Amino acid sequence: TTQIEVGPGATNATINFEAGILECYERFSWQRALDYPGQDRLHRLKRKLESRIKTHNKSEPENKRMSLEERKAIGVKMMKVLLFMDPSAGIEGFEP
């Protein structure tokens, strides 16, 4: 309940981060560790994200359109940077 103000670019950032989160749900699921309600949260997030990626892609031009799979890779790097608190984890999460 303490919100942090943000600019336009948070929308695309969140889709990529949350694509990263999905990739981790999925990898966790292969470990047979994800319980049944957890698996529902996985499938739910995949659906919402797929509709969000398709809504966002229409508003953006051709050279910046990204599929679920390419967005996953950006989110994973972002998550590596944060989990280690180290940009080198990392570096492309910042968009060089």
């Binding site: 670019g9 981060f17 972002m78 940077v81 608190m85 940009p87 080198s88 570096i91 060089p96």
Partner: protein, 151 residues
Amino acid sequence: DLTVKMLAGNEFQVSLSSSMSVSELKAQITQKIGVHAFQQRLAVHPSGVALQDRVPLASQGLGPGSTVLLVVDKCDEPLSILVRNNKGRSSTYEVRLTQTVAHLKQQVSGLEGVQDDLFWLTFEGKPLEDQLPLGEYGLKPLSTVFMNLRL
């Protein structure tokens, strides 16, 4: 001028002179975007090596036209500290380093029953300032903040 790059690629500019210290850059960043100094982790781009505080930025990899990476470490985990009233009586307060001195003073006011404008807090000799976060003073679990009465 210096480019500061955040996670997910938001960028902004910081102008540095005539000194070029890491502590100066951090204070610049706080002023530009409101992230407290104690929360800032800065690294050289693209190498990702952490900046060192006691070293001038010119002495590391950084001059004009260079880029630094900022990652914000929240440092918001609860801890408990002690505030000693004027009578010598210490009392514990649950706090977070990201809360303001003003907020801690509201807690102390409530417990001690003294209006917040009638006192100030000190830690290790120096005054705590209302608008700054507790993290700026390097408080630890059960550090003692002292309460001083105004006239």
